[PDB]
Amino acid sequence: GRKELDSYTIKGTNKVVRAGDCVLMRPSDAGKPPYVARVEKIEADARNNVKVHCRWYYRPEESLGGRRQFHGAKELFLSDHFDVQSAHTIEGKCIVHTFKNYTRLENVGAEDYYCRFEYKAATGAFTPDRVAVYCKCEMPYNPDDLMVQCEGCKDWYHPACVGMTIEEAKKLDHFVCAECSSD
């Protein structure tokens, strides 16, 4: 049979894994960046070697559409793929923030990830269905991309989309869109 375990400590590494935490898993293949899974259940086998029940986060590439324009570098999709893996497969814990708490980060580390979509793998479906769009390029926000906010419309714009490159945009003390100064 199997006992269910409250906590796992990885490799005496001062790191404690509990259900609900997000962790990284070594791929067998050398090239790949580590997989990112949410631990849902920890349990010890009959012979007392530990195993974990996993929900997978999908990278945009694994996903239906592939990486898109607005998909950030650390975009993940919570899947509905489940699995079970040896807990020796775990390397370190990582964090997968909500979109908003990601945007709030003082600065991003390899540790840090974010998710704004649940992705059904068999149907290829995405929840939610609607995205919010910005600028007059009218694209969804990509956190990697720098955006500036007019003080009139208080809409957000890409510097290039309004005809300035990034480092003058950094210089702007005050910004008003051209559409505010017209007609």
Binding site: T103, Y141, P143, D145, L146, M147, V148, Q149, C150, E151, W156, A169, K170, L172, D173, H174, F175
Partner: peptide, 5 residues
């Protein structure tokens, strides 16, 4: 102005 990162 206010920027987003």
């Amino acid at each position: 102005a206010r920027t987003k990162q």
